[model samples]
Target: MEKVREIVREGIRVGNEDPRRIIHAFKVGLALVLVSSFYYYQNAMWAVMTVVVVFEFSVGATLGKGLNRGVATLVAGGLGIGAHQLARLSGATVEPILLVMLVFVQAALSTFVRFFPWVKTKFDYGILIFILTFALISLSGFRDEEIMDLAESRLSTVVIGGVSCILISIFVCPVWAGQDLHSLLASNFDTLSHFLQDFGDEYFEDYKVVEKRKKNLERYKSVLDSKSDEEALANYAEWEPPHGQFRFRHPWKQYVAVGALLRQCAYRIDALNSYINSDFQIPVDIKKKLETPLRRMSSESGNSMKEMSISLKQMIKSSSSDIHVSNSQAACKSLSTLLKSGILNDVEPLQMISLMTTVSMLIDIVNLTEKISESVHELASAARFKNKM
Candidate 1:
């Protein structure tokens, strides 16, 4: 009883972590219930099955999947019936031969067509469904009088289930993929902001404090792997109708452009993080010479990103980020001049080289901040994000 109680308690907390998850669960249940009455129809099993398959957490994902499956099923079912009727025009032996020829040709064409890039990106699931529906309906006992009826029932049930799922997602507390993508991109900037600030402290702080802040530096590692997720959310967002701050023809693709730049920025942060974990030591006095400017660059750049993050979340423009970005850029050049202009040759070349490499990464990161700023600014104007009050 205690174990069961504890499990239920933790489950609620897990649901709390993303309240949308709990709401999404409710949506799935409500959609399933809506389709259950469909069971009164003898062929309603497909509708029931479709609710499970097409239901997604976000409105756009559900919309995309439901439409993909429905349209694919409609086309495939039509082709299957057409081919079946065409095959029946001949005698039994020729009918079997014609069916084989149709199946072989259609399967080969569909299989090879999916290899192209656009289909793979947007219609991969639809292509797979087309294959299954076409082959299954075409091949299912080329002997039945009710073949057309079966296809009709299957297609109808799929539409019923799929449309129900989409309606529930759109009407009952819709979670837009566009909104999720917006939040996720904002979060990448947030992570980058936290990472830069923490990295400055972790790199220069005493060993005990460095060890304590180690956990803070790991967010950038996952930020480096967020491309597929970014792409998928953007793709689904394309299918959504205008909701909240997103317009029907919103610049969803621009968000992807910004995410691409942010990933490169995260890559540099990841490289910097490796130094935090490694044991290459620049002597205390040598560090003192470089530490002030380096910390300034990181904190200022990080604060600039934070403003970008806040701007995105609030759907407003933040002009101050431009100034902070300028500060970081100016400091970046000053640090570069300081490095190449003078360094004591008395230290070991390896130790001196370590400091240079770290500085080089920081300098490059400042440039990346400029690129991100430009991308965000473009997105802002294109999206017509509001100006600050």
Candidate 2:
């Protein structure tokens, strides 16, 4: 009980640290409760409320979103029954088909409800509920009349439950998408900072760190994409592209290339490690220099890495491609220099000189990759700004 309280407190602190978010949550929660209570008392109006929740959860807004909820609700409810049953009985065998159907339903409804952001959310949700209802009826093999009655009842219950949540959320204290976006962006910056640390420490010269960096990069991208969408829904006026203005503004392209190169660098290092472990080895002096990264010797290097990563993450979140290029260049220079000084020194004098060429080549690659990322950030930012004014 004590632990639970502590955990809850911590979570609250983290999630509702911002007063705005807490206020929003309260409003949304109130709206949902109010709507739920109304339908709960009348029972017949319960379905209407559930449909409302679908839209509420999908996009951020008040009554405006509800308009979409109604459209998606009517469409999904009208055709969903048959589609739902077919999906239920086929299960494992036709799973792919069901997935396709789900996609089709979402896509069709999205286009149909293009005018209403809330409708898009509601229709997508309706499809989910429809599937659940159909599956239950199919599994039981109920009579046609029985099936219809149960489906109707279930749908009504869903509406009541959903509406209660929305009304509570909207009227009481709704969760603001802007707050969520800010939190997500901040966290992503932290993660990006961490990944950059690995790169900065020259650990990326080792494959394991490189792999983790790649994974984190993707995670960062995913969070950015989701956050961007939320921001767009919350305040269309401020909706900037996830990348920069152009289609190429996305950082994923550069990260993907970086990931590949990091892997290559890792593979080569592993081979070098293997070679050093076996056969005639390089001198301990060289190995010592390589192992003693600036991370350990100079706090400045660590600070720079932290700053660079955080800046890059901010650039990504804000879609700042132009600003990102300089930092990226800094990152590439630091990385390339570290790798060259460390790795090249480890080989025999004559052989070491030759290896320097490889290290320089890799540095060149890093510069190329950084420039690409800068371009993407620029493009995404431009598109996003254009969306506004």
Candidate 3:
């Protein structure tokens, strides 16, 4: 019952968020109906299958896949027809020998192609389709007297379906991969902001089994968990045409590096949280000196991260100067000075290390937050320039 509700909720959210999904559904339905309406085409299933295989969520993706599949189909169809004719000319005795050879060759050649770097990456799917098509065409041609007609019909239907899918995908309220990529990056920024803010406040607080704290912990986990999605979205975004004023080339590829940086920051956050959770005992004097400044540093870092998120969302660059960064550094400087006054000279070395470790983690957090802000600022500059144009 809970799963059902989740599905329904997702359905409504997708429908509302991107009405293009509905348009795509209608386009696919129309393509199928138009293909089936022509009863004269005996092998409509091939056409229908082509439509299903070629269509994608975005125009660029559909074009990429459709071109690959169409080339494979055409090549396979030509070779299948040629092989059938050669076997027929060779007479019945030679035809059986040639048939076995054709089967062996298809398998061997497809395997050979699979070994190529190009085929292993993008064209692997196309190569597999080629093998399937060749097998079906040859086997069917062997049994049917009208081999030429069979090949022509199959090839024509596939062409019709592939073309239809591309045309409809481009024309009807097309979804742009670039737009999706932009939104994904903005969402990541927002999530990271909330996480940094929450982690700062919650780290030194008493750990309780409260629901709100559990949810906050989960929110932190989410920032670390979004790496795969960020990479995938960036990859798909590469295939897309320019959406805004940016020419055909957009800077989506940089997102992978940005995501990597975020993950590294997440590691530091986790380490900082662990130290606080461990409840390492400290001298009252040392604790008193460290506690106020550490909290202040965390609070400043969180607010700065939040401001960066807002700036990214608005497509504005960070301040031209690092004046905004000065306060966080000053806080760290004051903390270091306090420790340098021989405040921990009488304390256990391990306890002193613990106090210093927290300070080091706090400094790393501030530096990482600043670096992330700079990266985001660069991306925003490009995007904002395009927006203005």
Candidate 4:
């Protein structure tokens, strides 16, 4: 009984994470029933196909693809009707030749259109469907005298399915890609904060290396896992209409750039960890001077980053005034003063340079963290959903 209960609980957790999968399943079943009831099996096939093809994880995707398929079907059906009419007027000997020419030309042109960036991004699927529908119509002309009626029926079925998908997607518990995008960004910020906090403790606090390494690995893994999701959500968000605080001209593209910046910060963090593991050891005195203040800097930076994450998640302005940054800057200035004071003059030049290199990396991290916070704040300002209320 306990095992069965665990299985059920896991299923619930999975379902909650992605309710769209369940909704899509239900919608597809509903579509099958409605299409079957309304049309003959042959015509119902197109309607069912449209329903299957049109439904996406988000409303924007469903609406965009449904519109594409609908417009493509109309244009392809109309051209097929034109070809049928043209074949009838010409001599019987030339009728087959013209039909063949139309098929070849339509397929070739539509295939070429798939290579264009704008068309490929928005309507590649539509162009492919157009070719298929056009070929079906052109082939049907050989047997059916009333080819126009067949074309009309095909277009009608597609429209029914397409319109049904768009309406149901928009009106029924609609999901927005922009919402997912924001959520992902917030999650990443939190991950980075955790990584920084852990790294600071591991490096400056003299934590147990083996245990600390495990925690560090897990934190960094979380950051890496989200990289692809950010890009994909941003792409989908671009197609979405204005919702929440986002303008109709929402800068969805910036999410990709910001994600890239986060990855760079992660890279620097990884480098810092690598140096910590290296054989070069700083003298006890130099390590003492840099340790406590740098650790404080790291902790404060991590806290600031976490606050930014929370602000984004809640869609509120960040209250962080970078007190930690001022503290960190002061610590860095003190370290600079020490370096100039000849206190480290006894240390070998090689070890001294190595210490300085580590210091330089930490400063870079501080600056990078500030940039990340600013970017998130800019994005938050643009996304005024919670603020608007």
In model 1, the Cα lDDT at residue 228 comes to: 93
Q: What's the count of clashing pairs in each model shown?
A: 0, 52, 0, 1
Q: Candidate 1: where are CA atoms >4 Å away?
A: 1-13, 38-42, 140-145, 206-213, 336-346
lDDT of 4 by residue, 1-389 (tens): 99999999999999998887898778767766766676664467788888888878787788788878888888988888788788868878898888899899879988998999988766888898899889888876445556777888888888898888777777767788878777777777787788778767766545667776776766656676676687667766777777666777878777777878877777777777778777766655657766776777788788887877677667777546356566767877776776788766776788778877777887888888778767866776775435531
Model 2, 75-133: lDDT tens digits are 44555456555665677658547746665665565456545766443344444444444
- Per residue, candidate 1 scores C-alpha lDDT tens digits across 24-65 of 888888887767865764466677788999999888889899
Worst 10 residues of 2 by lDDT: 236-245
Best by TM-score: 1
TM-score sort, best first? 1, 4, 3, 2
lDDT by residue (1-389, candidate 3, tens digit) is: 99999999999998999787898888778867777776455577887888888888877677777777778878988888888778877897788679768977987889798989856746777888798888777775346457767777877877788788778776767776666665666666566567666656655544554665575556657778887777656655676666554465567767678778877877877776567556555645556655677778777777776666555455555663255557888887897788779876877789878877877887998888778767776776765542331
Candidate 4: segments with Cα more than 4 A from true spot: 1-20, 34-42, 142-145, 205-214, 225-227, 276-286, 319-331, 383-389
TM-score of model 3 vs. true structure: 0.78
lDDT of 1 at 81: 89
- Against the true structure, candidate 1 reaches a TM-score of 0.90
Worst 10 contiguous positions by lDDT, candidate 4: 380-389
For each candidate, the alpha-carbon lDDT, in order, equals 0.83, 0.46, 0.72, 0.76
Clashing pairs in 1: none
Against the hidden true structure, what lDDT does model 2 obtain? 0.46
